[PDB]
Amino acid sequence: HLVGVCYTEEEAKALAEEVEVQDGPNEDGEMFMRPGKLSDYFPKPYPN
Amino acid sequence: TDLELHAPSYPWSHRGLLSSLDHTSIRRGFQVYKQVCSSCHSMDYVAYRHLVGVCYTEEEAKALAEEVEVQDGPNEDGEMFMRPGKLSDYFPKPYPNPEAARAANNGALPPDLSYIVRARHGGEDYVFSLLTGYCEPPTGVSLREGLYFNPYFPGQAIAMAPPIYNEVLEFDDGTPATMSQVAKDVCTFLRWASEPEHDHRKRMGLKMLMMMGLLLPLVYAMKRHKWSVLKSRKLAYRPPK
Amino acid sequence: REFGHLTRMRHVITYSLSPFEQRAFPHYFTKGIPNVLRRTRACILRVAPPFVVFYLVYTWGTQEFEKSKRK
Amino acid sequence: DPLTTVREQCEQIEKCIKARERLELCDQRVSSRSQTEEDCTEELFDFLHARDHCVAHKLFNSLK
Amino acid sequence: TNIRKSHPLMKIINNAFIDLPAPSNISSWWNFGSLLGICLILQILTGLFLAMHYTSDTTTAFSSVTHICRDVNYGWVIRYLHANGASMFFICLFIHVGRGLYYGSYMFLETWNIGVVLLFTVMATAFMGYVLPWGQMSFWGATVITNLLSAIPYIGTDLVEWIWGGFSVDKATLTRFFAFHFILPFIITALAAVHLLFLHETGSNNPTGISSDMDKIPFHPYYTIKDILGALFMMLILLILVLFSPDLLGDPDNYTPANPLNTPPHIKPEWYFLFAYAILRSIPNKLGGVLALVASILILILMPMLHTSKQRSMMFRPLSQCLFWMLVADLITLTWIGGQPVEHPFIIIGQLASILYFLIILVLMPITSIIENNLLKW
Numbered sequence: 001h002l003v004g005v006c007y008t009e010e011e012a013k014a015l016a017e018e019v020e021v022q023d024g025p026n027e028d029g030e031m032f033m034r035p036g037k038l039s040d041y042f043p044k045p046y047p048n
Numbered sequence: 049t050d051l052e053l054h055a056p057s058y059p060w061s062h063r064g065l066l067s068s069l070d071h072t073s074i075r076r077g078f079q080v081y082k083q084v085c086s087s088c089h090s091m092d093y094v095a096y097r098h099l100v101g102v103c104y105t106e107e108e109a110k111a112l113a114e115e116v117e118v119q120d121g122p123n124e125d126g127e128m129f130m131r132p133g134k135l136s137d138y139f140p141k142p143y144p145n146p147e148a149a150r151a152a153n154n155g156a157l158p159p160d161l162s163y164i165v166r167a168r169h170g171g172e173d174y175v176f177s178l179l180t181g182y183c184e185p186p187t188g189v190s191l192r193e194g195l196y197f198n199p200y201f202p203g204q205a206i207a208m209a210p211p212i213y214n215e216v217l218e219f220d221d222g223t224p225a226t227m228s229q230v231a232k233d234v235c236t237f238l239r240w241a242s243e244p245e246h247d248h249r250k251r252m253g254l255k256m257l258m259m260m261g262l263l264l265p266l267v268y269a270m271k272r273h274k275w276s277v278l279k280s281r282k283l284a285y286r287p288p289k
Numbered sequence: 290r291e292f293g294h295l296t297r298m299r300h301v302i303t304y305s306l307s308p309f310e311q312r313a314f315p316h317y318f319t320k321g322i323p324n325v326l327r328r329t330r331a332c333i334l335r336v337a338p339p340f341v342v343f344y345l346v347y348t349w350g351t352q353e354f355e356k357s358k359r360k
Numbered sequence: 361d362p363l364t365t366v367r368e369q370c371e372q373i374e375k376c377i378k379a380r381e382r383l384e385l386c387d388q389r390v391s392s393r394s395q396t397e398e399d400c401t402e403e404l405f406d407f408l409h410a411r412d413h414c415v416a417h418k419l420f421n422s423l424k
Numbered sequence: 425t426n427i428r429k430s431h432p433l434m435k436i437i438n439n440a441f442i443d444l445p446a447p448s449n450i451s452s453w454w455n456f457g458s459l460l461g462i463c464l465i466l467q468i469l470t471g472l473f474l475a476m477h478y479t480s481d482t483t484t485a486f487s488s489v490t491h492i493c494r495d496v497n498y499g500w501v502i503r504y505l506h507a508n509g510a511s512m513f514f515i516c517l518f519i520h521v522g523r524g525l526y527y528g529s530y531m532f533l534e535t536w537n538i539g540v541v542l543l544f545t546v547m548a549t550a551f552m553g554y555v556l557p558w559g560q561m562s563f564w565g566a567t568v569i570t571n572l573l574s575a576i577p578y579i580g581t582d583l584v585e586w587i588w589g590g591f592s593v594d595k596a597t598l599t600r601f602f603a604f605h606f607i608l609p610f611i612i613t614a615l616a617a618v619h620l621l622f623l624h625e626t627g628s629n630n631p632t633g634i635s636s637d638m639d640k641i642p643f644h645p646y647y648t649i650k651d652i653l654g655a656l657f658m659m660l661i662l663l664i665l666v667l668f669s670p671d672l673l674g675d676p677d678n679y680t681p682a683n684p685l686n687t688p689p690h691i692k693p694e695w696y697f698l699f700a701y702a703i704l705r706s707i708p709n710k711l712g713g714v715l716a717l718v719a720s721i722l723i724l725i726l727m728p729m730l731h732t733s734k735q736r737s738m739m740f741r742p743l744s745q746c747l748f749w750m751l752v753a754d755l756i757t758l759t760w761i762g763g764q765p766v767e768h769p770f771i772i773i774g775q776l777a778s779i780l781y782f783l784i785i786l787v788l789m790p791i792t793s794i795i796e797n798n799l800l801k802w
C-alpha cells in the first residue's frame with residue numbers, strides 16, 4: 001500500500017526484507033520462516 | 049486396446065424402495081476403516097459427532113478420539129500445543145503433509161473416500177468387485193515395479209497392494225473375519241459416508257405417498273362435480289321452415 | 290372481449306341438468322374401455338412407425354461399437 | 361473362505377468351461393514366438409463376466 | 425354494487441383469471457403453461473436459500489456445497505429439489521413448444537416471438553448454475569464453451585477473458601458466473617408477464633384450429649380446478665425423484681472436485697443439453713459449429729412464414745403428423761448420440777441426423793402442406 005504514496009517498489013521490498021516472518025506448514029519441514037514477500041501486513045506486536 | 053469390465057449387481061439389504069441400512073454392519077465397517085485404511089486414505093468431511101445414533105453411543109464415541117492426539121493452534125506461553133481429540137474433530141489425515149504423498153505410493157495419490165461410492169459408475173458394487181477381484185496377470189501383460197493386476201480397474205494396472213486377505217482384524221462381537229465378511233462392511237460404511245440422509249429420505253417418502261393418497265382422489269372428485277354440467281348437456285337447431 | 294360481445298347466433302337451444310341431480314360415475318369401465326380402444330386405433334399408425342426406426346438404429350448402433358474391439 | 365467355496369462350485373457351468381476352453385486354447389499359443397504383442401486380457405474377461413454373474417446371486421446368503 | 429367489477433385492483437384479477445372467456449374443448453396439453461410458472465417460482469425460492477450458504481471461490485466452492493448437504497438443517501432436501509426441479513422445468517418446456525407447433529399456435533405472432541426469447545434466456549441461466557458447484561464437469565463444461573467462444577472473428581478473444589474475471593480460474597472467477605445466474609431468472613419473470621399480455625388480446629387456440637367465440641365458458645371454476653389438479657400431480661412426480669432416487673438424472677463424475685491436472689474419462693453434459701452438443705460435434709470447424717448451434721433455436725422464428733396449408737392445426741392433416749413425429753424421433757436420436765464417445769458408428773449417425781433436423785422444418789414440411797391442399801381442391 002506504500003508504492004506510489006511515499007516509496008517506490010524497490011525501497012519497499014527492501015523494507016519488507018528487514019523483518020522475517022513465520023510461514024506455514026510444508027513437507028520435509030515444519031511451519032518454517034522467511035523474510036517479507038511485499039504482500040505481508042505490518043507485523044503484530046503481542047503474542048495474543 | 050484393452051477395455052471395460054462392469055461390476056455385477058449384489059443383493060444389498062438397502063436396495064429396496066423402503067429398505068434401511070443395517071446399523072450393525074455400519075459399526076463393523078468403521079473399524080475396518082480405522083485400522084486397515086486411514087494409513088493411506090482421508091475422510092475429510094466426516095467427524096466423530098456424525099456417529100452418535102448411527103452406530104455408537106455418545107460416550108462410546110467420546111472414548112474414541114481419545115486414542116489420537118492432534119495439533120492445535122498457538123496459545124500464549126506456547127507455540128504448538130497438543131491435546132486429545134474432541135467430538136468436533138474430523139477424521140485424521142493419513143499421509144502427513146500433502147500430495148507429494150505419491151512417494152509412499154509410487155506416485156499414485158490415494159483418493160479421499162468420503163464420496164467414493166457416489167463418485168463411481170457402479171457405487172458399492174464397484175468397491176466390492178475391486179477389493180475381492182485381485183488376481184494374477186494373464187499371458188503376457190506388462191507390469192511395473194510397484195503395480196498389480198486387477199480386472200475391475202480401467203487400465204488393469206492398479207497401484208494399490210491388496211489390503212485385505214483373511215483374518216486381518218478381530219471384530220468385537222465375535223463375527224468371523226473372512227475375506228468376504230470384511231469388504232461387505234466397508235461397503236455399508238462408505239455408503240453411509242456418501243449418503244448420511246439415506247434412511248431419513250426413505251421415511252419421508254412414505255409419509256408423502258400416504259398423504260397424497262388422501263388429497264389427490266378428492267380434488268379429482270371436486271373436478272368431476274363441476275364438469276358434469278357441461279358433460280351432460282344437449283343441443284338442438286330449430287331454424288324457420 | 291367480454292361475454293355479451295363475442296359473436297352473433299340464432300336458433301340454437303341448450304338443455305342442462307344440475308350437478309346435484311346427477312351420478313358421479315354412470316359408466317366408467319363399460320364405456321371407458323371401448324372408447325379408448327377407438328382413440329388408440331385412430332392414432333397408432335401415425336405415431337408408432339417413427340419410433341420403430343429409432344429402435345432399429347439403436348440396436349444396430351450398439352452392436353457395431355461392441356464388435357470394434359475384441360475380434 | 362465362503363467366497364472360495366462359492367467361486368469354485370460355479371466354475372463348472374456350461375458358460376464358464378466354454379470360456380475356459382478358448383482361454384487355454386490361446387494361452388498355449390502366445391508363449392511360443394517371443395516377439396508378439398498379443399495378450400489374452402480379453403479372454404480373461406469373458407470368463408470373469410460369466411463367473412461373477414453367478415457368484416453375486418448366491419454369495420450374500422453365507423455372510424453376516 | 426359488484427365489488428369484483430368496480431374496485432381498481434379486483435378489476436384486473438377478475439378480467440385476467442375469473443371472468444375470462446375460454447374455449448370449452450381445451451385439452452391437458454394446455455396444462456403445461458401454468459406448470460412452467462410453478463416450476464419458475466419453485467426455482468426462485470429454493471435458489472434464494474442456497475445463495476446464503478454458497479461461496480464463489482475456486483478453493484471453497486466444492487466444499488460449501490458439501491457443507492449444506494451435511495451440516496445445515498434441511499439443506500439436503502433443498503439442494504436436491506433445486507437440481508431435480510431444473511429437469512422438471514426443461515421437460516415441461518419441451519412439451520409446451522411441441523404443443524404450439526402441432527396445433528399452429530405460432531400464428532399469434534407477438535406471443536410466439538417473446539417465447540423464442542424466453543427459450544434462450546432459460547438455457548443460458550441453467551448453464552451458469554452448473555458451473556457453480558465446481559466439480560469435474562463444471563470445469564470441463566466451462567472450458568468447452570469458452571474455447572468455442574473464442575471463434576468469434578473480431579471480438580471473440582475479448583469476451584473470453586472477461587467472464588473469468590480477467591484470467592484463468594481463480595477466486596474472482598465465479599463471481600461473474602454467479603451474478604449472471606442470480607439476475608437472469610428475474611428477467612425471465614418480466615418477459616413472461618408481457619407474454620401473457622399479448623395472448624389476452626385474442627384468447628386461446630383450441631385443438632381443432634377453428635375459432636370458438638360461440639362456445640366460451642368462464643375460466644373460474646372450470647380451469648381453476650383443472651390446473652390445481654395438474655399441479656398436484658406434478659409435485660407428486662418431483663418428490664418421487666427427490667426422496668427415492670435423487671441421483672438418477674445426474675452424473676457421478678461431478679462428485680470429484682475440479683482438477684486441471686487429473687483426467688475425466690468422458691465429457692457428458694446434462695440430458696437437456698445433449699441434443700445441441702451432438703450438432704456441434706458434427707461440424708469440423710469452430711465457427712460453423714457455434715453457428716449451427718444458434719441456428720437450431722432460431723429456426724423457430726421462421727415457422728409463421730413457412731406455413732403453406734389452408735388449415736391451422738394438424739388434427740385434420742394426416743401426412744403432416746407423420747412428419748411431426750419423425751422430428752420428435754430425431755431429437756431422441758440426437759440425445760442418445762450426444763452421450764456416446766466419438767467413434768465410427770456414432771459419427772455418421774450423428775451428422776445424418778443433424779441434416780434431417782433442418783430438412784424436415786425447412787423443406788419437407790412446406791411441400792407436404794401443398795400436396796394436402798391439392799388433394800382437397802384447396
Ligand code: HEC
Nearest residue numbers: 080084085088153156157158159164175206207208211234
Ligand atoms: C498402503 C496403501 C493402501 C491401503 C492400506 C489401501 N489402499 Fe486403496 N488405494 C491405494 C493407492 C495407492 C490408490 C491409487 C490407486 C491408483 O491410482 O492406481 C488406491 C485407490 C483406491 C480406490 C479408488 C480406485 C479408483 O478407481 O480410483 C478405492 C475404492 C480404494 N483404494 C479402496 C480401499 C479400501 C476400501 C481400503 C481399506 C479398507 C484401501 N483402499 C486400503 C493404496 C491403499
Ligand code: HEM
Nearest residue numbers: 454456457458460461524529530539540542543616628629
Ligand atoms: C418460462 C417460460 C414460459 C411460461 C411461464 C409460459 C407461460 C404460458 C402460459 C401460462 C400460457 C397460457 C396457457 C397455456 O396455453 O398453456 C402460455 C401460452 C402460450 N405460450 Fe408460453 N410460456 C413460456 C414459454 C414459451 C415458449 C418457449 C414458447 C414458444 C416458443 C411459448 C409460446 C406460447 C404460445 C404460442 C402460447 C399460446 C398457445 C395457445 O393458446 O394455443 N411460451 N404460455
Ligand code: HEM
Nearest residue numbers: 467468471472474475478507510550553554556557606609
Ligand atoms: C430458472 C431458474 C433456475 C434454474 C434453471 C437453475 C438451475 C441451476 C442448476 C442446474 C444448478 C446446478 C445444481 C447442481 O446440479 O448441483 C444451480 C445451482 C445453483 N443455483 Fe440455480 N437455477 C435457477 C434459479 C436460481 C436462482 C434464482 C438462484 C439464486 C437467487 C439460484 C441459485 C443457485 C445457487 C446458489 C446454486 C449453487 C450450487 C448448488 O447449489 O448446487 N438458482 N442452479
Ligand SMILES: Cc1cc(C)c2nc(SCc3c(C)cccc3-n3nnn(C)c3=O)sc2c1
Nearest residue numbers: 440441446454457458620623624628648651652
Ligand atoms: C391454478 C391457476 C391459477 C391461476 C391464477 C392461473 N392463471 C393462468 S393464466 C390465464 C390466462 C391469461 C391471464 C391471459 C390469457 C389466457 C389465459 N389462459 N387461457 N386459457 N388458459 C389455459 C390460460 O392460461 S393459469 C392458472 C392456474
Ligand SMILES: Cc1cc(C)c2nc(SCc3c(C)cccc3-n3nnn(C)c3=O)sc2c1
Nearest residue numbers: 547548550551554564565568692693694697700
Ligand atoms: C443457448 C445455449 C447456451 C449455452 C451456454 C449452451 N451450452 C450448452 S452445453 C454445456 C456443457 C458442456 C459442453 C459439457 C458439460 C456440461 C455442460 N453443461 N453446462 N451446464 N449444463 C447444465 C451442462 O450440461 S448447450 C447451450 C445453449
